[PDB]
Amino acid sequence: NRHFIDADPYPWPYNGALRPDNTALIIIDMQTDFCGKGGYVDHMGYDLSLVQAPIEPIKRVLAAMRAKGYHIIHTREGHRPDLADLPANKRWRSQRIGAGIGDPGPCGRILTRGEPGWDIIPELYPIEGETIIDHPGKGSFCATDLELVLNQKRIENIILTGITTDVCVSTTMREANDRGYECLLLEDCCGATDYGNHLAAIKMVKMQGGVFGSVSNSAALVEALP
Amino acid sequence: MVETNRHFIDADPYPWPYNGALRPDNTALIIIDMQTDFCGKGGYVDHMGYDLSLVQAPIEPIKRVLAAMRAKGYHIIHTREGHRPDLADLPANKRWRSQRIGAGIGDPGPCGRILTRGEPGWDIIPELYPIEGETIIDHPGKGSFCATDLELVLNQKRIENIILTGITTDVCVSTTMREANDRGYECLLLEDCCGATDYGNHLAAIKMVKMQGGVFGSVSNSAALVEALP
Amino acid sequence: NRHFIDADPYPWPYNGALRPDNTALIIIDMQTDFCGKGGYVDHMGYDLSLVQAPIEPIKRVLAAMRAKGYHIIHTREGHRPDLADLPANKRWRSQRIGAGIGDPGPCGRILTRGEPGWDIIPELYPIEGETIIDHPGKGSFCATDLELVLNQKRIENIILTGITTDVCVSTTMREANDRGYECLLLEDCCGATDYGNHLAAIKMVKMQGGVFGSVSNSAALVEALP
Amino acid sequence: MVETNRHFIDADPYPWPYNGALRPDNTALIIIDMQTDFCGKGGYVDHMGYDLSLVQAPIEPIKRVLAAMRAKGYHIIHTREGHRPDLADLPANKRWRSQRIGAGIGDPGPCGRILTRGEPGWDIIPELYPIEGETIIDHPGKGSFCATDLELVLNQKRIENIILTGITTDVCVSTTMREANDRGYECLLLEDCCGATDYGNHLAAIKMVKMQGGVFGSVSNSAALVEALP
């Protein structure tokens, strides 16, 4: 009763134990300031097109997985408004490049919880029953309840999407993988503002027999999802 | 004439550490996973075929950094990827992938059971071997913090700054750096003191550090470190 | 320049390094449902006076520590409204005794974030700059950002107050202690609805040369606080 | 006869485990810190002046539970409180308190360095010694989860239910139970298979488990467990 998604370097999940009850989609950090028109990333002159590219593929995956009753998780990078959870180095670096965390930006205080720019874009907005992880690190597990939630939901398999490929997506995948979760990265459902780093982050997954999991795409997923 | 207790290493994208608080008592070198099976002649990677040279390249630069930091009384930490001999800490997926490529964790290899604690091939190579007082982290994950006492040890030693070296750049080195960075540690990657199975992935992992004002920390090299280390 | 508070079994903190910048008060779980008139604990017929007894001493400590610019932290036990962070056993036990987590109670859904009964009582309410930890376990560190926050604030010493002595107070103290924090329990600033368990939890702290830290009282603290 | 795959142990305040899902593959015994120095002459606990009879009392009941659970193929886990020999994992306060009462961690004792890994007094007593395949957790905290791989191991073994035994009831046993419970594990404390430095603290720690509908789990005894274990 095994089901697999075509993937590289191996058909996923490794053991074919692919069910709604043990599998989650995670949509990482699809926040206005990071990928929306007029957000701080746009205003900083970064290559915003590369982080908008995954929106439509993600929307298709999200619709398909909702329809089939899979677990859906979303994440938002951000800090408490009093900045208690903000490391001094993280803050200093952000100030040095003119995107200081907690400072005013075009859509509110940058990377600050409760602000408009920090929220998820409307095109990928959560619905009730889809857990949202608010995380202060680049890996979504650090200092959050993500692992607790995954464990109570008895999730074994994680399908990763979102931004950026080389930062929060890769870090969260690595954290999950170390703990035993079986992870699939959808290459057309992630992006970074450096395309080379996007492609390299994906390549890294596949090495050594799928060191961090396996890689597929939205069409292959939607076609074969049970 | 004018003396300062702030000290920096020339680094990219910013001089490191960010605040110049660079002292023996708050700074550690970490040498990641310089183990025989991974970089050594006759280990399991060698027995599979062609190319150890990329993961051996950092040995001499690491040795220079290690010697310099020992002489100046900096904290020195080493790590080893590996599993309990009964494999209780080995996830099923990790095991299955390693079996599928012919390097099954816990399976017999030319230097003992692959990635298995206590076996000859699993140990750190003699030329970078720890000495007394240099903590060794035995880790079952690619990130050295997961399921270990690394963070507890760092905190009791009041370590603020970490200098990362070892192998592989894109796997255990990058994962450990990301975990440390998230927790507030200030990290420097020495680019000539790491290497990977694919040189392009090595270079990309280094580039990733530098983006967005040094998202994971900063990058330097052994010569710049040794020259400016207080 | 060492400063100590009189305490049992040793003067606290162990090394006398007692400063506003390295020391936090933590006020644990002083929530309406747990200690307020008409909350679920009151309606169940427990002896509410034992968990109200610490309010006035806590107020005195809180005022003194605010005035001197010490770090102030508050905690609230609770669950996400969709109960994603609620273990099945925790839920089942609560249902079995007629205080089901997430079920309707006299002040709103029991132990559910955002509900009236779940919030901190008005007499001990946080002010801006005082971090609040929302925790799904009895130990406030589990699945939260408390440790991350303590580390960024460079906190070494923790003064524990709140309720209940034997559950969240003792558990949070034990977690902190294991990680190297130096902890003081203020015995008149905690309570439980079984006074024997309160007293025993306090006794446990002092054994073996102060296995979990040291114990004092609000008067001794306020008198000697630098 | 009507047969069921739900099975319960008579326990207080509720029959355990809550859902009756009690099988060898999902259930572990954990034997906490039955080490020579906690329950034998010359140890840490001995140096503090406590009465050894209270911590020896659980030996025979634990032995019976251990034998029964081994025979039925249940998971068996053991723990040892202790520190790396260089004391890198030893908080300064923990060390200072132990020195103040004359049982300094790492100081020489009649059975080796107190609470120091690799020393004779730190090892598990022979009457409860692990066998191959029984994971041992070496922990620097009073809660066995802190800074260890216990959680990772539990998760890879798909353990849901934990039966706790060992010493001391109010310190490492209670702390480990609370950590497990918070993470969703379903825990049973065997009251005749634990003991403490003060019998009243033992009894109170057990009572604490039962309050509020079994806030930390449920409580039973060796005879009830062995009688009903599937």
Author numbering:
A (entry chain D), C (entry chain B): 8 to 233
B (entry chain A), D (entry chain C): 4 to 233
Sentences from the paper on this structure:
Herein, we have described and characterized the structure and catalytic mechanism of BiuH, a cysteine hydrolase that hydrolytically deaminates biuret during cyanuric acid catabolism by R. leguminosarum bv. viciae 3841. BiuH is structurally and mechanistically different from the ‘canonical’ AtzE from Pseudomonas sp. strain ADP, which fulfils the same physiological role; i.e., it liberates a nitrogen atom from the triazine ring and allows further degradation to make all three nitrogen atoms bioavailable. The protein is a tetramer (consistent with SEC); each monomer adopts a five-stranded parallel β-sheet which is surrounded by α-helices. Helices α2, α4 and α5 (residues 95–102, 178–186, and 202–213, respectively) make symmetric interactions to another protomer in the tetramer, forming a dimer, as part of the basis of the quaternary structure.
